Amino acid sequence: LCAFKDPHENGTILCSKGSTCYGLWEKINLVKQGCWSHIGDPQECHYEECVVTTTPPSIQNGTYRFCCCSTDLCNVNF
Amino acid sequence: QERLCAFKDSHENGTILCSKGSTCYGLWEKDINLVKQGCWSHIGDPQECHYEECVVTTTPPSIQNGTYRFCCCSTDLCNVNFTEN
Amino acid sequence: NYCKRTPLYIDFKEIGWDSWIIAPPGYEAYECRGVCNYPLAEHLTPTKHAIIQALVHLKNSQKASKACCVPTKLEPISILYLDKGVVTYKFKYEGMAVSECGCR
Amino acid sequence: NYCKRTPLYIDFKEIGWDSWIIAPPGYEAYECRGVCNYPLAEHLTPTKHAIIQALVHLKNSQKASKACCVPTKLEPISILYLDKGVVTYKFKYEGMAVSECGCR
Amino acid sequence: PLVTCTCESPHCKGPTCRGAWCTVVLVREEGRHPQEHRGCGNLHRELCRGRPTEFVNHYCCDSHLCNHNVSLVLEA
Amino acid sequence: GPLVTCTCESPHCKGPTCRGAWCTVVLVREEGRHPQEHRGCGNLHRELCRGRPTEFVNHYCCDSHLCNHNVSLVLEA
């Protein structure tokens, strides 16, 4: 179970099929949240908390902060 | 276009409407007895089988000591009779 | 050259399939022979993986391999075979001929 | 070796896709590398052509070519990309990773 | 109706498999050592009816462990 | 949709010009050889057109008539 912010009831979503919780920020505004597919094998989406271990992409002058985790209601904060 | 051929196993009293550019085929064993008739897919593409007559140009397969005569043609009701050479 | 539908004739007597296939003695299948060099053409219906694969092959040819020229659409042929001593007829013998090649 | 789902990691910075792909920076794709030697195994989902193709290669390796170890089923991943300056989210980015390999 | 066969192919996950018919395959490439394969068969039984060739000979039996010690032969 | 006629300079070309949704210019040499320029049409896979130019590939796409004829590209070093 994760939070939801994509263009369920008012900011929550039940992520099924082994999907993980993802959260996107720009640093700090909040961009999007929701489910993240476990396929692709991201070494950072099987974390216990939303931790930005990866270097942010140089796009947008280095603002986008992304992290994922595999626990319920973990994408509420980094 | 749609080619009607003879049948020997919609079909109705010895004929069949072969659609999608399929060709007419006819099989015999030679006392020339008639084995089967009907439609033949153009995707077999031996040469697309755009022949006007059923001509057994190929030597019969070595099974049954060379009795089965098979041919295809691209005209309507052409698989009724075959030829040689 | 490039990914192309090169011709290939399968004589059933040469591969031992004439023991049960009465007709046809052979049919013109088709083989996809060639290389899949970037840019991958759209007439070969490429996938997102095969395109991503060839891109890594451009950087380092050791880490990844090129895309392969394989059949993408297979069409059936008509046959006359022998089931239990009785001549049987099959209009759609699936997957025998190749109509479209592509890189996967 | 044999047809196998060998691992492959696609770093989007190496192919230049980080300009529009926000997340993930990379994903564990898979490549199908190996040989397709007769008999063709059924877990490689072979077709009637790939079986008929490899048989002709056994007779004469010049007239025909071997079947190729290619992806047969591709599964989607989740991405966060930039469409006209707005962050867009796609749950099913189809055809990015390889789930099943096979001979075609 | 599944049957338990003998597995002697490089693709084998165990000494025995389960399938519809058992298979014995002989695969000698020109100027190479003949390879004998034992396994199961769930599709494409049209191969089982193939005349033995100088490079391939297909064999299929529908009995319990019938493909244990089946030895095949190729044409000259 | 509104199709556009582009210039065809790829080995896969059936004629001097093709018709498609967007025109494409591709530069495709990393190392070991001299860069090769490709001109053609694009009806699918627009995700390539927005890729940062790398040392081996550069993608450009425009939606105007014959816009990809005399576009000169460059590869990173």
Residue numbers in the entry:
A (entry chain J): 33 to 39, 53 to 72, 77 to 127
B (entry chain I): 30 to 38, 52 to 72, 76 to 130
C (entry chain A), D (entry chain B): 321 to 424
E (entry chain F): 30 to 105
F (entry chain E): 29 to 105
From the paper:
The TGF-β ligands are dimers and initiate signal transduction by forming a signalling complex with two copies of a type I receptor and two copies of a type II receptor; all are single-pass transmembrane proteins containing a small extracellular ligand-binding domain (ECD) and an intracellular kinase domain (ICD). Upon signalling complex formation, the constitutively active type II receptor phosphorylates and activates the type I receptor; subsequently the type I receptor phosphorylates Smad1/5 or Smad2/3 to regulate transcriptional responses. For example, ActRIIA/B bind to and mediate the signalling from both activin ligands and some BMP ligands, whereas BMPRII is the low-affinity type II receptor for over 15 BMP ligands. Of note, BMPRII is particularly highly expressed in lung vascular endothelial cells, where it mediates the signalling from circulating BMP9 and BMP10.
In addition, we solved the crystal structure of the ALK1:BMP10:BMPRII ternary signalling complex. There are 4 copies each of BMP10, ALK1 and BMPRII monomers in an asymmetric unit, assembled into two copies of BMP10 ternary signalling complexes. Complex 1 (cpx1) contains chains A, B, E, F, I and J, and cpx2 contains chains C, D, G, H, K and L. In the ternary complex, while good densities were observed for all BMP10 and ALK1 chains, densities for BMPRII were relatively weaker. Overall, the BMPRII-signalling complex assembly resembles the reported BMP family complexes, in which ALK1 binds BMP10 at the wrist epitope and BMPRII binds at the knuckle epitope. No direct contact is present between ALK1 and BMPRII. Overlaying the ALK1:BMP10 portion of the ternary complexes onto the previously reported ALK1:BMP10 complex showed no significant conformational change. The buried surface areas at the interfaces from the ternary complexes are generally smaller than those from the binary complexes with only one exception, but in the same range as the BMP9:ActRIIB interface in the ternary signalling complexes. We questioned whether fewer interface interactions and a smaller interface area would translate to weaker BMP10:BMPRII interactions in the ternary complexes. In the surface plasmon resonance (SPR) binding assay, indeed, BMP10 bound to BMPRII-Fc surface with ~5 fold weaker affinity when ALK1 was present. The fact that the extended conformation of BMP10 is only observed in the ternary not the BMP10:BMPRII binary complex suggests that BMP10 type II surface in the ternary complex may not be the optimum surface for BMPRII binding.
